[PDB]
Design a protein that fits this description.
This is part of a larger assembly, with 2 copies of chain A, 1 copy of chain B and 2 copies of chain C. Chain A is mostly beta strands. Chain A contains 2 helices and 14 strands. The relative contact order of chain A is 0.27. Chain B is largely without helices or strands. Chain B has a single domain (about 1-60), classed as Irregular (Foot-And-Mouth Disease Virus, subunit 4). Chain B has 1 helix and no strands. Chain B is rod-shaped, with a radius of gyration of 27 Å. The termini of chain B are far apart. The relative contact order of chain B is 0.06. Chain C is elongated and about 80 Å long. By secondary structure, chain C is mainly beta. The chains are: A mainly beta, B little secondary structure, C mainly beta. Strand 1 (about 5) of chain A pairs parallel with strand 1 (about 5) of chain D. Chain B: This is Capsid protein VP4. Chain B: It comes from Mengo encephalomyocarditis virus.
């Protein structure tokens, strides 16, 4: 009547991620009601959608880019690599969230908030260039890829979504080494028309830059990034 | 959702033991049960009515 | 899509809003909070003092490898009182304390991963603990677990020849035999008198005297663990696993240093 | 046909509080009928409600306080801290019970029994002051908090209940160190009117002081206090 | 609320009686008696005599770490006859016996916690026993359990080369192998001929002769345990666990010393 068992070779091992529970030692303990509580979330995707600041001019990072009164088709206002590893994104919640997973999929959202004067006017060309032929070198080449024209007026910001264009269903989150001329392409910001203004107004303005996940965005396989010290 | 547990078997320890017990408090309070068990000392003869009575002062 | 971020809320899109595209959603469940923290991570190495199995307990540390541990993902220890009962701290101490020193490995005890990534103000959960002796030979370990806010000075030996850890009706765990697997595992309930626990910081004092020292809310841990054992030379790792985690109010995470290098990072 | 098992890492451990039973070695043993027995209880809460004596004038403890023929608004007859750790409560069943648990919640009941002469008369002001502003220093400040006026007359005692006023659902039972100016406030007893009497009667009386749990009172998580020796 | 305590019974209230308040009840089950005593606590350290595994048993103690133990939460031993079979006592003996001596650790064997808190006159329960060797190396232990009031002088060796503990049909337990966990566990029934057991004191004598010695009621324990084994140098702790405890008639607990200090206590 005692039951016969066969002991597996792995007898005694401890698995840090075992899909199971252990021995309870202090049962029947009621907790302190926490039912008045608010603000709970349950999925990181629930908040990955909130835009945080992209760092410009690293390592002297500022949360914005500057538009000028000159449109050089040869000069991007910004060039971001589309990699959740860009030093550019290093401190966005998107990047901080993403660094705990192995792969991502879906839309990335670059939000621009114009902060100049109400009296200023201007147009920007924001483009996404998939990899393969290198980064575009003039607005004329960028304009050949996915892009949008942002006109300044009553409405303050512009939300640009870079479409997930990829051979694989998912893309690796982080880079092992550095990713070349690769990565997954580039977001470049250009002036189409120069910032124009009347007399009595500054001749340049700051554009706030943020990033977030699109409704499309997914992350999978939780891991740990290489440990670091903020200092 | 749930965590990282994916065993088919019913938990061998019951819940009140495997987990803490989530309770909820209502804003306006709750009445203790009337009695905590049946232990008690009793007071008898507390009052009246009945004896060698009404010879007894008014 | 034109938008107005000043409202404090921004409409979410997919490639579909501005271009000729299609949504590309695919389901996954590894981003749920509970699933994410429901895995073990280490908080440090500990030690047992010689002959603690049969005498009065006393705070002590081996190489900044102490005797007792507070169950909390936050920093604790303070290498300067490696011989005093440990305490919760409001900062992490580097490996050395002067220029020429090093940050890793850290001296204090904490769940560095939790610290590095906890985008919430408050949380509630049950704690699963794993004790792992750094030896594959026999190992005896006596553990005393005290709920938060209860007596934590297991100093008086009441029974002749019995560890003072091994006293009372307070939960005690003991593994020691030639056929054990040496490791110990168990899960403790949530005992803070608090409804929910501060995950990073608590902006208030300890007394109404405002004898000003903000940071930690009192009795906001899972209790203290005391160790006694037979291999005073083997150290053991302690790991925490958050069972049924719940978090409230998103907040920022730890700063990541600007690559004064490339336009991307890596690993290490 | 022998069944394959995976041995968990914790193989061989002993848990002092395991929610389970062990091997029975002497079965089928009938007991001696004890069915004539009376007086059984099943929950400590069942008896925590019986008042026991508060010790006054520690360490020369007496079970009472003394009322005098003078009402100094500046002089409390007693000041108890509302802590199940007060040296004041050290020997009450409430305190002895409570010291085996980590937290409590609910009402505390301070009972006063007047033991003076039938010919005496008097009024007391009993107050409960929540923490935050320190202990009251005169009856005038106490009177600003929760209080009751106890008039002496035919009925001998007065049952004062200190309401559970707290930010947390539960309060810690015992103190780690000593609790300052804290603890959970104070119960102070003051004379409103002096003890008055006729000729031929003593000019002071003893008031018996006891404490008990209210119907509200709860205790949770059994532990062990620090060991002590009564001598 | 006005009241009259002289009646011997006092009406219970909540803040609701005298003020504008609300009851604040919340359920919990850790205050039930059965739950409270259904956890293990130690009664002392014991020892085995050399080569007891293969010879006649004989009372003996190592460091006031004897050979046999009476299953009872009350005091027993009497360090002055550490070499005689142990007995139940009516007082606890300090560590030393002269001024300059110390109370802890106690010399006698008892469930100090039970002693410190048993607010009942009588109780009934089953006893769960745990034997824990203070070693993580192999350990052999032979145990003989005798019901209360039965023969307790396991002194005659009847079989050549077999412990005298290991004789008869009296329950014997033995653990000894290279793959054991060294500890032993088992639960014994309730064998006193008494209906219910005195928990603290029994105001009567042992014979009708009134050869006056009050305190303990005869056969009011759970029996005696005798030990023989192979590591005469390792001591082991014995723990008691009260299974399905029942108590009758509340009575006072042990006195706690007046803090000739503060207006509160602590720990230790």
């Amino acid at each position: 009547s005692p039951i016969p068992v066969t002991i597996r070779e792995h007898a005694g091992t401890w698995y840090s991620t075992l899909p199971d529970s252990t021995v309870p030692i202090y049962g029947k303990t009621p907790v302190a009601p926490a039912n008045y509580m608010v603000g709970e979330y349950k999925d990181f995707l629930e908040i990955a959608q909130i835009p945080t600041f992209i760092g410009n001019k690293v390592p002297n990072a500022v949360p914005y880019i500057e538009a000028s009164n000159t449109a050089v088709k040869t000069q991007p206002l910004a060039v971001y690599q589309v990699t959740l590893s860009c030093s550019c994104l290093a401190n966005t919640f998107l990047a901080a969230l993403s660094r705990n997973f192995a792969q991502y999929r879906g839309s990335l959202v670059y939000t621009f908030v114009f902060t100049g004067t109400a009296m200023m006017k201007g147009k920007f060309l924001i483009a996404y260039t998939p990899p393969g032929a290198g980064k575009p070198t003039s607005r004329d080449q960028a304009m050949q890829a996915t892009y949008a024209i942002w006109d300044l007026g009553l409405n303050s910001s512009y939300s640009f979504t870079v479409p997930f264009i990829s051979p694989t269903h998912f893309r690796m989150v982080g880079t092992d080494q550095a990713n070349i001329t690769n990565v997954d392409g580039w977001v470049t910001v250009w002036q189409l028309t120069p910032l124009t203004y009347p007399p009595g107004c500054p001749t340049s303005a700051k554009i706030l830059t943020m990033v977030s996940a699109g409704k499309d965005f997914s992350l999978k396989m939780p891991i740990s990034p290489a440990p670091w010290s903020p200092q | 959702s749930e965590g990282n547990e994916g065993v088919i078997i019913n938990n061998f320890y019951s819940n009140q033991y495997q987990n803490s017990i989530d309770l909820s408090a209502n804003a306006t309070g709750s009445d203790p049960p009337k009695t905590y068990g049946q232990f008690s000392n009793l007071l008898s003869g507390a009052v009246n009515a009945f004896s060698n009575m009404l010879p007894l002062l008014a | 899509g034109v938008e107005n971020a000043e409202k404090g809320v921004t409409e979410n899109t997919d490639a579909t809003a501005d271009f000729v595209a299609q949504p590309v959603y695919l389901p996954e469940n590894q981003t749920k909070v509970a699933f994410f923290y429901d895995r073990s991570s280490p908080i440090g190495a500990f030690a047992v003092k010689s002959g603690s199995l049969e005498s009065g307990f006393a705070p002590f540390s081996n190489k900044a490898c102490p005797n007792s541990v507070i169950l909390t993902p936050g920093p604790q220890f303070d290498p300067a009182y490696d011989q005093l009962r440990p305490q919760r701290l409001t900062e992490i101490w580097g490996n050395g304390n002067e220029e020429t020193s090093e940050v890793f490995p850290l001296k204090t005890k904490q769940d560095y991963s939790f610290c590095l990534f906890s985008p919430f103000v408050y949380y509630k959960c049950d704690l699963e603990v794993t004790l792992s002796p750094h030896t594959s030979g026999a190992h005896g370990l006596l553990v005393r677990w005290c709920p938060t806010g209860t007596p934590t000075k297991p100093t008086t030996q009441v029974l002749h020849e019995v560890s003072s850890l091994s006293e009372g009706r307070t939960p005690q765990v003991y593994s020691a035999g030639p056929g054990t697997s040496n490791q110990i595992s168990f899960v403790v309930p949530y005992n803070s008198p608090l409804s929910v626990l501060p995950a990073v910081w608590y902006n208030g004092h300890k007394r109404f005297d405002n004898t000003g020292d903000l940071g930690i809310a009192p009795n906001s841990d899972f209790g203290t663990l005391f160790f006694a054992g037979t291999k005073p030379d083997i150290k053991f790792t302690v790991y925490l696993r958050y069972k049924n985690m719940r978090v409230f109010c998103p907040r920022p995470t730890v700063f990541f240093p600007w690559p004064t290098s490339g336009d991307k990072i890596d690993m290490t």
